[PDB]
Amino acid sequence: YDICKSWVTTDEGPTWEFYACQPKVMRLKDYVKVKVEPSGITCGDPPERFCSHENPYLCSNECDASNPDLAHPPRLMFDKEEEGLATYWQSITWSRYPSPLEANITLSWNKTVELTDDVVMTFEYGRPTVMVLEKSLDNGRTWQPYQFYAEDCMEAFGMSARRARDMSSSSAHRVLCTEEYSRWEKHVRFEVRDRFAIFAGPDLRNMDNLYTRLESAKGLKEFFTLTDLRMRLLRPALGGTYVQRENLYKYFYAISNIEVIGRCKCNLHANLCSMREGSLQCECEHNTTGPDCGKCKKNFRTRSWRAGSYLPLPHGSPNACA
Ligand SMILES: *[C@@H]1O[C@H](CO)[C@@H](O)[C@H](O)[C@H]1NC(C)=O
Numbered sequence: 224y225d226i227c228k229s230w231v232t233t234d235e236g237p238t239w240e241f242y243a244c245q246p247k248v249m250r251l252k253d254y255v256k257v258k259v260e261p262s263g264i265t266c267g268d269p270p271e272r273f274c275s276h277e278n279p280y281l282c283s284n285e286c287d288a289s290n291p292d293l294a295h296p297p298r299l300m301f302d303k304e305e306e307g308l309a310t311y312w313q314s315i316t317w318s319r320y321p322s323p324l325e326a327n328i329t330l331s332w333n334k335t336v337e338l339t340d341d342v343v344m345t346f347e348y349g350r351p352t353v354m355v356l357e358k359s360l361d362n363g364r365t366w367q368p369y370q371f372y373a374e375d376c377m378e379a380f381g382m383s384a385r386r387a388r389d390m391s392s393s394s395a396h397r398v399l400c401t402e403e404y405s406r407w408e409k410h411v412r413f414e415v416r417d418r419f420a421i422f423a424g425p426d427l428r429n430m431d432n433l434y435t436r437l438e439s440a441k442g443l444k445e446f447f448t449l450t451d452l453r454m455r456l457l458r459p460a461l462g463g464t465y466v467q468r469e470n471l472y473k474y475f476y477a478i479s480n481i482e483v484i485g486r487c488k489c490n491l492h493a494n495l496c497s498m499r500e501g502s503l504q505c506e507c508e509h510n511t512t513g514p515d516c517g518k519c520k521k522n523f524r525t526r527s528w529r530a531g532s533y534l535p536l537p538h539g540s541p542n543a544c545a
Pocket residue numbers: 260261325326327366455
């Protein structure tokens with residue numbers, strides 16, 4: 224689905240032929256607007272000591288937001304790292320214990336995007352005991368749970384622990400709770416590739432079946448769609464025991480990387496998506512308009528707008544505006 228139109232030779236002469244088309248897969252973290260809340264959740268204002276791997280007993284490592292060499296701003300979750308040098312955002316220590324240590328990390332695209340691979344969240348001082356990943360489809364006006372993470376899913380959310388890998392073709396779009404990334408390894412994953420594998424096989428060689436279901440199965444493609452993601456961090460790493468009240472300088476969130484892989488949502492009417500008026504927008508084909516090619520162009524409204532289709536394989540139906 225790389226081609227929107229092609230100049231073909233028929234029994235009547237040369238014409239333009241139209242196909243369902245999709246833009247390229249991007250490094251979505253490159254287009255992210257980050258916001259970390261609440262105010263003052265990020266270490267270093269005022270300067271604060273913490274326990275690091277190098278100094279785990281004297282705990283004299285300092286986070287100071289006014290010193291570039293000692294600051295951990297949110298921008299460090301999205302930079303290009305050099306070998307042996309992981310850079311990370313860092314929260315305040317759990318000095319307010321038993322008050323919960325909570326951080327809301329919001330990722331905004333101001334464009335509907337489609338996940339094509341796993342969401343990978345990389346932690347430096349242990350992965351959370353409790354975290355919820357949420358998604359928005361209307362630019363943060365509304366939020367819905369997308370994935371739950373807990374060391375104990377039943378204790379945290381009252382949900383049975385399940386894997387995306389254990390789902391059937393009728394439940395590939397189900398929001399699950401998992402213990403795989405929290406149970407006492409830096410990566411927390413939101414399993415996209417495993418959900419494709421339900422339809423395409425674990426080798427992803429049955430692409431035909433996946434394109435067929437992305438079309439025929441209700442809410443399947445919308446499941447991979449979003450304008451925003453939010454990581455609600457609820458409880459930090461506990462090291463497999465109860466909180467050590469004598470040393471709270473030990474507990475904090477440290478995130479070196481958030482990898483988000485996918486393409487713009489162009490309703491199968493565009494193979495190009497780029498920055499237009501300061502935000503990602505589709506370069507619409509098929510006589511369509513709007514940022515997602517969701518509407519017909521002004522002088523092309525003889526028929527009601529339809530999205531393009533992956534079907535019939537391999538090029539699908541363009542379902543152009545007339
Ligand atoms: C996180 O966002 C939720 C609303 O989605 C809000 O109720 C909660 O208080 C926020 N947490 C913090 C620590 O700000």
